[PDB]
Amino acid sequence: MGERGVEMRLRIRFESAECEVELYEEWAPETVRAIADALPIKSTANRWGDEIYFTTQVAVEKEENSKDVVELGDVAYWIPGKAICLFFGKTPISDDKIRPASAVNVIGRIVNSMEGLKGVADGESVVVERA
């Protein structure tokens, strides 16, 4: 009941795909509180080149962490916009590498799943829930 820290995993299912992701305080225990606060909730998924970002109505913004580079397989939350986004390929600016944004936090990565959600259908439901 709150006797740890590096063990905060959430669930994110899709009408045509499913995947799990964990999280580490590297971003900030304070912000992590909002994500956990936004358990089972309805959200609309927006399709984008090997990228997916949906709003959950949770407005959590602060100046900290905000990274812009990451390796294939890791997951991150879009700070400027309070929107979460998966990573399994290109992004708004593929070119030679993968640029998810200019200031997004690393909310962990996809381990027990390795699903290819990136192949989601244009516009589909989304329900965020912490396990």
Alpha carbon distance 63, 84 (integer Å)? 17
| DSSP state at residue 64 | S
Alpha carbon distance 56, 116 (integer Å)? 22
User: Which CATH number describes the domain made up of 8-131?
Assistant: 2.40.100.20
Alpha carbon distance 54, 34 (integer Å)? 15
Instruction: Tell me the residue ranges of DSSP E strands in 49-123.
Output: 51-54, 74-78, 83-87, 104-109
One-letter amino acid at 27 equals: W
Other residues' Cβ atoms within 10 Å of the Cβ of residue 62 = 13
In this structure, the strands spanning 41-48 and 74-78 are unpaired
Burial of 50 (0-12, 13-18, 19+ CB in 10 A): middle
Find out whether 4 and 118 touch, Cβ atoms under 8 Å: no
User: Could you state, in order of their start, the residue ranges of all structural domains in the chain?
Assistant: 8-131
